[PDB]
């Protein structure tokens, strides 16, 4: 389809332009609320872990796909394998309130304890990047902090996820003619 090449309005020259027809296309596996609510591993510290979603790595699935959005809203539920007792603390409380047990602790039940946390940020929508102080994110961009005796592996997933204002997403650079990796085979 010949177009106006610079107006940057969307054009889709479909396959009917040279004969043929299009089929019914289903897009459930690329939905933004379906692709983001599954568990991802992050590396923990020993005791205190702020529950920021931008400490998910950039090589994983829903860490590199969360950074597709500029602004995101999602309720977090965590799943942490620990020993001792794990106290969750809401957004913006003093970090001395991690030791107190009136805050929502979870007693140790083998092997791990998963629990659903609300969106406790003051902002209407969180963000993945912010040019305010030249890390380089405010202290308000967190779901709170969890503190145990020694956390071993704590996992994030983010549900009811709404995303806004897309950002570029990068696949790794081939040095060959095409990036050929060893696919699974019998």
């Amino acid at each position: 389809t010949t177009s106006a090449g610079e107006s940057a309005d969307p054009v889709t020259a479909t396959v009917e332009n040279y004969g043929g027809e299009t089929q019914v296309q289903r897009r459930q596996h690329t939905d933004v609320s379906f692709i983001l609510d599954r568990f991802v591993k992050v590396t923990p510290k020993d005791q205190i872990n702020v529950l920021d979603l931008m400490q998910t790595p950039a090589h994983t699935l829903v860490g590199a796909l969360l950074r597709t959005a500029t602004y995101y809203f999602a309720d977090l539920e965590v799943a942490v394998k620990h020993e001792g007792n794990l106290t969750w603390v809401p957004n913006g409380a003093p970090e001395a309130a991690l030791d107190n047990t009136t805050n929502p602790t979870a007693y140790h039940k083998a092997p791990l304890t998963r629990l659903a946390l609300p969106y406790t940020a003051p902002h209407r929508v969180l963000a993945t990047v912010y040019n305010g102080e030249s890390r380089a994110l405010p202290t308000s961009f967190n779901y709170g902090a969890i503190k145990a005796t020694r956390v071993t592996e704590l996992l994030y997933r983010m549900k009811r996820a709404e995303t806004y204002c897309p950002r570029p997403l990068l696949a790794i650079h081939p040095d060959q003619a095409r990036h050929k990796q060893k696919i699974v085979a019998p």
């Binding site: 389809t1 010949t2 177009s3 309005d9 969307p10 054009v11 889709t12 020259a13 479909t14 332009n17």
Partner: peptide, 11 residues
């Protein structure tokens, strides 16, 4: 935005 895409031809 993706549903207002122009199609067909121009001439």
């Amino acid at each position: 935005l993706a549903s207002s895409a122009f199609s067909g031809l121009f001439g």
